[PDB]
């Protein structure tokens, strides 16, 4: 349904490899994040092109396509 790899670099300089698709919302994404890494959703700020990407869009919204990098700031937040 149009699978792709996009890349996820963190603030410690490593970069994780994400399979979605067009329709992915940005929530979802950061669900896929949290498979991989422990890191809560409500805890990820997701930059795309130097902007923070909003939970609802999707990546063809954003026009996020294979291969593209992401950038990952994470928080520390009280549950």
């Not at 994780?16 to 979802?28: K, M």
């Not at 909003?54 to 291969?67: C, F, G, P, R």
């Not at 992401?70 to 549950?79: A, D, G």
Request: proline share 5%; aromatic share 6%; glycine share 6%.
């Amino acid at each position: 349904g149009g699978s792709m790899k996009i890349y996820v670099k963190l603030q410690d300089g490593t970069v994780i490899e994400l399979e979605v698709e067009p329709s992915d919302t940005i929530l979802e994404v950061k669900e896929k994040i949290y498979e991989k890494t422990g890191i809560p959703p409500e805890d990820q700020i997701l930059i795309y092109k130097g902007k923070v990407l909003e939970d609802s869009k999707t990546l063809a919204d954003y026009n996020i396509q294979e291969n593209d990098v992401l950038y990952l700031v994470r928080r520390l937040k009280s549950p």
